[PDB]
Amino acid sequence: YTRVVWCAVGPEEQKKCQQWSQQSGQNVTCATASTTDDCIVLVLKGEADALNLDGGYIYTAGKCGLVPVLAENRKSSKHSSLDCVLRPTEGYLAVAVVKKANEGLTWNSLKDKKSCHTAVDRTAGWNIPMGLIVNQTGSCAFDEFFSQSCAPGADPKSRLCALCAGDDQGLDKCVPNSKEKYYGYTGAFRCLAEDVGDVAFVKNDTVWENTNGESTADWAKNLKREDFRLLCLDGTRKPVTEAQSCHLAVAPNHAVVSRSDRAAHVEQVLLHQQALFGKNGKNCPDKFCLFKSETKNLLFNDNTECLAKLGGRPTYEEYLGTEYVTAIANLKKCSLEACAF
Numbered sequence: 001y002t003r004v005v006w007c008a009v010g011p012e013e014q015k016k017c018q019q020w021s022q023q024s025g026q027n028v029t030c031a032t033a034s035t036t037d038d039c040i041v042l043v044l045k046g047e048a049d050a051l052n053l054d055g056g057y058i059y060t061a062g063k064c065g066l067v068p069v070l071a072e073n074r075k076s077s078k079h080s081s082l083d084c085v086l087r088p089t090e091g092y093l094a095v096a097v098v099k100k101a102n103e104g105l106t107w108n109s110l111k112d113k114k115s116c117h118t119a120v121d122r123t124a125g126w127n128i129p130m131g132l133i134v135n136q137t138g139s140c141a142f143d144e145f146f147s148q149s150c151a152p153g154a155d156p157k158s159r160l161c162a163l164c165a166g167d168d169q170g171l172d173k174c175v176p177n178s179k180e181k182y183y184g185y186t187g188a189f190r191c192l193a194e195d196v197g198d199v200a201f202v203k204n205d206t207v208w209e210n211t212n213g214e215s216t217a218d219w220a221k222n223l224k225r226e227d228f229r230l231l232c233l234d235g236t237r238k239p240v241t242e243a244q245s246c247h248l249a250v251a252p253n254h255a256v257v258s259r260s261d262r263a264a265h266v267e268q269v270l271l272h273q274q275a276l277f278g279k280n281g282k283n284c285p286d287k288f289c290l291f292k293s294e295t296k297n298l299l300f301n302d303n304t305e306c307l308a309k310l311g312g313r314p315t316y317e318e319y320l321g322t323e324y325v326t327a328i329a330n331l332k333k334c335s336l337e338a339c340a341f
């Protein structure tokens with residue numbers, strides 16, 4: 001029973017998982033894959049137990065029977081009376097970020113520009129923006145909208161990968177894992193910060209966490225929030241301080257998923273695990289902290305306060321919501337009930 005196998009995506013999450021495994025006295029063990037899709041297959045096969053996912057993948061994993069167990073919960077101002085684990089999730093804001101110095105660039109003049117996406121199939125980095133674009137465009141040719149981009153998970157030979165850089169030696173170009181320089185929230189923001197792309201599709205928090213001395217990372221040390229602007233749907237540009245009134249959509253928090261027949265056992269282990277390495281864990285600051293990885297968001301976003309119970313034992317459809325689910329469906333129509341394997 002009680003031993004849980006976690007699936008790490010890429011060499012960086014593997015090493016973090018191994019530390020976790022070590023400190024957990026084998027209560028947690030690691031399996032590794034080169035992509036989130038592969039990890040999902042390992043979980044379906046039962047060679048793995050769970051992994052934390054972005055809404056976009058939860059849709060995929062859901063169709064194949066996997067279920068949401070616990071969701072990430074970040075520190076919020078409202079609902080302060082309830083404990084983190086019992087507190088309702090609020091979701092994150094999907095935004096489009098651009099350089100202020102790139103005057104004249106608005107949501108209505110994105111065509112033929114350069115884009116930076118977290119990775120194909122993710123919420124803020126792909127489903128939301130590309131979905132809105134396919135609608136407003138009335139075409140399924142989202143592979144021709146931008147001139148060049150870096151969208152991890154696309155054909156390496158396509159313009160959708162043209163801007164990706166791969167690893168320190170140039171290998172793994174465009175792979176959907178942290179080996180790729182511009183992968184995920186941080187990678188997509190860096191892609192913008194280094195003026196590789198004209199626009200980055202990440203989440204509100206990504207801009208705050210990597211500006212004004214919050215990162216210390218060689219490429220973000222001198223980044224100032226004021227040099228950035230948010231593209232709203234009404235064609236307007238606003239400061240990153242107005243995200244509540246200028247976002248593309250609100251996305252459901254990343255959540256841990258396992259097979260339905262194992263969720264109970266995974267839920268038990270995780271709660272006890274975070275009691276030890278969580279934010280105010282018995283051994284987090286001193287020995288190991290599940291939610292830290294120096295702005296790299298490994299296994300879990302670095303801004304996670306705790307993993308929270310769901311309440312209402314929601315199916316994957318109920319967890320993502322009808323709004324979002326229909327959006328992905330309509331966008332999928334471009335690339336009707338299935339399980340991709």
Ligand SMILES: *[C@@H]1O[C@H](CO)[C@@H](O[C@@H]2O[C@H](CO)[C@@H](O[C@@H]3O[C@H](CO)[C@@H](O[C@@H]4O[C@H](CO)[C@@H](O[C@H]5O[C@H](CO)[C@@H](O[C@@H]6O[C@H](CO)[C@@H](O)[C@H](O)[C@@H]6O)[C@H](O)[C@@H]5O)[C@H](O)[C@@H]4O)[C@H](O)[C@@H]3O)[C@H](O)[C@H]2NC(C)=O)[C@H](O)[C@H]1NC(C)=O
Pocket residue numbers: 075076077078080204205206208209214242243244303
């Ligand atoms: C976009 O993404 C950004 C990054 O994720 C995000 O900014 C992040 O927001 C969080 C909070 O949501 C910030 O962390 C907070 O920082 C403060 C300052 O360091 C911390 O210090 C205090 O902690 C208190 C306890 O929670 C907090 O009290 C809260 O609750 C009280 C009462 O319940 C209440 O206080 C009010 O005070 C009034 C003035 O006197 C008083 O008259 C009134 O009666 C009332 O009681 C407030 O509700 C209050 O929030 C204190 O206020 C302090 O916060 C705090 O613990 C927490 O760590 C992050 O720093 C920030 N990130 C960055 C990079 O800055 C944006 O908000 C996101 N944007 C959107 C649209 O969501």
Ligand SMILES: *[C@@H]1O[C@H](CO)[C@@H](O[C@@H]2O[C@H](CO)[C@@H](O[C@@H]3O[C@H](CO[C@H]4O[C@H](CO)[C@@H](O)[C@H](O)[C@@H]4O)[C@@H](O[C@@H]4O[C@H](CO)[C@@H](O)[C@H](O)[C@@H]4O)[C@H](O)[C@@H]3O)[C@H](O)[C@H]2NC(C)=O)[C@H](O)[C@H]1NC(C)=O
Pocket residue numbers: 127128131132135322323326327330
């Ligand atoms: C890209 O573009 C596509 C094409 O437009 C778009 O697809 C659609 O998204 C919209 C919004 O997400 C879907 O909206 C619909 O609203 C109908 C009305 O029901 C809502 O409104 C009620 C009153 O305001 C609310 O009380 C209710 O809670 C709900 O919010 C829905 O229909 C009904 O079901 C009722 C059952 O009680 C019934 O009684 C009614 O007669 C009615 O049939 C409807 O089902 C729908 O949700 C719309 O469905 C989507 N269309 C398709 C074809 O899937 C994408 O959203 C868009 N993508 C992006 C990223 O923007």
Ligand SMILES: *[C@@H]1O[C@H](CO)[C@@H](O[C@@H]2O[C@H](CO)[C@@H](O)[C@H](O)[C@H]2NC(C)=O)[C@H](O)[C@H]1NC(C)=O
Pocket residue numbers: 002023024025027272276
């Ligand atoms: C590995 O899992 C086991 C099972 O929970 C833990 O052993 C329990 O630990 C607590 C705290 O020491 C004791 O109160 C229980 O009596 C133990 N036995 C049970 C309930 O089986 C152990 O703490 C975990 N190890 C690590 C390092 O996380």
Ligand SMILES: OC[C@H]1O[C@@](CO)(O[C@H]2O[C@H](CO)[C@@H](O)[C@H](O)[C@H]2O)[C@@H](O)[C@@H]1O
Pocket residue numbers: 311312314317318319320321322323
């Ligand atoms: O209010 C959102 C909250 O409600 C739940 C049920 O407790 O889901 C509801 O909203 C979904 C989104 O449209 C529906 O698909 C679902 O049937 C409905 O119950 C939670 O899952 C969600 O967090």
Ligand SMILES: [Fe+3]
Pocket residue numbers: 054055122123124251254
């Ligand atoms: Fe996401």
Ligand SMILES: [Zn+2]
Pocket residue numbers: 247249250
């Ligand atoms: Zn909104």
Ligand SMILES: [Zn+2]
Pocket residue numbers: 312313314315318
């Ligand atoms: Zn239900």
